[PDB]
């Protein structure tokens, strides 16, 4: 919480970029900390077709390390820096912990059952295929078909790196902000 | 403390007196470094204060390393995008130490600047803190009224019949139930009035001896309707025990008890001791109109709110009654034909005179008694006139705020409609871009990414 | 004077008329030196006025050599760190001469700027001086209420028992004493009511002839309790003589006198002349409830405050009573069976009719008398209705402000807690530095010097 | 919406979670152009 401490010191934001983020961050939450209730208000504005509160709840937990209850600006930026301008390795662990709802690191097709459901839920019911009750399960089933060899963290890292198509999608937003 | 920081040379000069009576240990002076005023441009209006002025409170935004986020370097000034006429009171805090509340500024924006700059409402000066809380109370009450959760069938019939019971103005069955309950209460009390009055010989027999064979049927039908509607209310109350503990259920129980109590009493033996008491209690179904009429609820609320004032009314009334009854009894006792036999006998005269009612059955017949009777009348006027305005004032305030609150709910529904309209417009704007601004281009790309991560497309 | 200084050439031109009728002594003109506007930057907002404008009042901060302390040389401007929207009214004074009070500005900050710049509240213009004093009075009352010294055993038991007597809601003995005193007063007045009412033969004998052998014991026990509690109050009053002169002690003396007076009277001979008077005076123990109930104290305060209004009430009441009694007596005199024998006899009818009481035993029976009786009733309504609202308004205001005052005391205790918390935090901050800001470094050095001048060390 | 516009990098960072469970179609980022404060002088009193 200095401005120079979170400078280009394992934080991928410059001094001017840090100033812009804090002006926007404190604009919505003047107290300097944003909580889960407010964390869903901004996210739901970007996706008005459905409700993003279900996905924001899992997103907030990933941002809120140590389950403090409120996510501060110091560790809010380092989450943005890892996700936006971070390296390959840091992005995958952050996403792995986003799917890993519980404490220990494992994915068992029930923990991320809600994750894919939240992605489909936040589109509302207005799409061309009119969706389906079992369409989130099909997306999970095909997702496990490419990494789940037998029944982990090491598997997730090697599977994403094996397919270059997901590789070029992770680095989508580093060039523009 | 750090607030009085310009007086450090004064304190250091005071420490010189310790040296003659001291044992010099070479206390190692800190040997500090060595003051130009800085600019605080809050959206156009530049504010200039010395840096030492801000640093004397190193736990807020202005005095901290936090303001380095708002430093705009090429102009060598701190640029904040906040209110220019509210940051004026922020700077005054760093000089004196007490915040001042602007009587002309909205309190929802004043609190926004206090939270932004790190100040707290606990440090505002005592000069304006009473009004700050008063204006904070009105804003707080506005939030509570607007967030009362008045929204009104995924589960069993209990909720969808309780919503009709609680709100009889909706649907079509709720209104019918409301009307039939009101009609039954009215006909019950009217019929009671009829059998109390004589209708017709051996004697002027009332309507309760030759008649009242069908009046009993009407009374038992009304009691049965009351009991069954109470049971239906019980079958839809999530707070069944608490709902029973509520005042409305207590009134319903009091209304329905007398018929069953009388039936039990007449099942075994029969006496007239509790007959008149039960007949008196039978009229308590009049208070069941509280649900039907909002006026009764408002009256109950205003009586419960100023309960202390009614207690003082009763205490002062009893005090004056006792004093004046004693005076009149001891002043109008030796008369030839006097009805002031005792202080309790003078209680009736005292309460008649105090309320400016007047009957003439008991009148003073002595020069001493008439003066104290007039003084009793004036003192009764004075005593009763004190708590009357406060009851009426509270009643009017409650009725106006419960007349208000209705428009508060109306603006909430319109506000949600505007939010939904914006959501529909934002969704429609994306489709128009798909068929064929600065931020809108990037925002639609996020939706485009969401489309192609689930291989689905938004359509109209 | 110096206020009209731009009109000096006008005055010098007027002096030309003296020269034809003068005897030129060579009056030695002063031959002065010879005007650019100066900048008054009060914390960012620069204010520009001519130097001659400020110099016309050479007894304040702006027009003096005192403002040379606030001259900041390299910018060639005077920099003050004061309120920018209150210094606006300071400059307007130097033009016209009358200060203007901002209705939207806190008076505790307005007075701060007036004291800072040398102005005084005696020079504010008559246009806004009535409201300035009114807002000053409210601020003054806030200070007085907040500084009432409500703090509550280094000396004898007198103070530690008077604190229980004055405040019966604290401790456990004070509450017991309060409850027992209230119970004794209530039982005394109730027992008096009982012996006044008949209980039972030769005659309808009341409860004071066959009974009242134990009633005398109860009365003397209550009087003894009152006397001993009065003595205990006397044994703990630092203002013993002044406390006796107080209204509460007078009421206590009036309550306790009748028993001893009656005992003295019955010790030697016995007559009934003062028996009824003493029995009437016995009930004056009712007013002892003033200590118990705050409502009685508030009522007494509001009657004492508007004592002039009660005097006008009494004067107008007597005026109307006399006029209407005379009119009714001379208008209803020649009736067959008339009770209007005289104006004093018509006083009863007039006071009954004016208060809208009505008895019907003494009524007019003439066309002339009925019209004046109706006019008497209307005039009584008008006369009584004038001072009733002011009594109720003052009572409500006093009750609300004593309901307020309580929260004023509550915020004072919280404010002292914050001050003590800051003192504890400042002391703790020094220890943390000792175990391991800008001003904090020098401040801790002063404490370090204080440690080593007495070879002692602060510890947790 | 456009009201919360300074949180666009936050929303873009949130979209990273979709990539592991997606099928990357090359969503064609807009490739925007790239912020000095402007003056709004309403009759003498400049607003920035």
Author numbering:
A (entry chain H): 36 to 186, 191 to 216
B (entry chain B), C (entry chain D): 2 to 35, 40 to 157, 163 to 210, 215 to 450, 472 to 495
D (entry chain A): 2 to 35, 40 to 53
The authors write:
Modulation of voltage-gated potassium (Kv) channels by auxiliary subunits is central to the physiological function of channels in the brain and heart. Native Kv4 tetrameric channels form macromolecular ternary complexes with two auxiliary β-subunits—intracellular Kv channel-interacting proteins (KChIPs) and transmembrane dipeptidyl peptidase-related proteins (DPPs)—to evoke rapidly activating and inactivating A-type currents, which prevent the backpropagation of action potentials. Here we report cryo-electron microscopy structures of the Kv4.2–DPP6S–KChIP1 dodecamer complex, the Kv4.2–KChIP1 and Kv4.2–DPP6S octamer complexes, and Kv4.2 alone. Thus, our data suggest that two distinct modes of modulation contribute in an additive manner to evoke A-type currents from the native Kv4 macromolecular complex.
The structure of the Kv4.2–KChIP1 complex reveals that the intracellular N terminus of Kv4.2 interacts with its C terminus that extends from the S6 gating helix of the neighbouring Kv4.2 subunit. KChIP1 captures both the N and the C terminus of Kv4.2. In consequence, KChIP1 would prevent N-type inactivation and stabilize the S6 conformation to modulate gating of the S6 helices within the tetramer. The present structure of the full-length Kv4.2–KChIP1 complex reveals that the C terminus of Kv4.2 tightly interacts with both KChIP1 and the N terminus of Kv4.2. The C-terminal cytoplasmic S6 helix continuously extends from the transmembrane S6 helix and terminates at S450, which is localized at the bottom of the complex. Although the residues from G451 to G471 are disordered, the following second cytoplasmic helix with a short loop (C-terminal segment: S472–D495) fits into the hydrophobic crevice formed by KChIP1 and the Kv4.2 N-terminal segment (A2–R35) from the neighbouring Kv4.2 subunit. In addition, the cytoplasmic S6 helix (around S450) is captured by KChIP1 directly and indirectly, through the hydrophobic interactions between Kv4.2 (Y444), Kv4.2 (H479-L482-F493) and KChIP1 (H84) and the electrostatic interactions of Kv4.2 (Y444–K448) with Kv4.2 (H483–E486), respectively. In the Kv4.2–KChIP1 complex, KChIP1s bind and sequester the both N-terminal inactivation ball and the C terminus (amino acids 472–495) of Kv4.2, which would therefore result in preventing N-type inactivation. Moreover, while S6 gating helices adopt a more flexible conformation with weaker interaction with T1–S1 linkers in the structure of Kv4.2 alone, KChIP1 stabilizes these structures and enhances their interactions in the structure of Kv4.2–KChIP1.
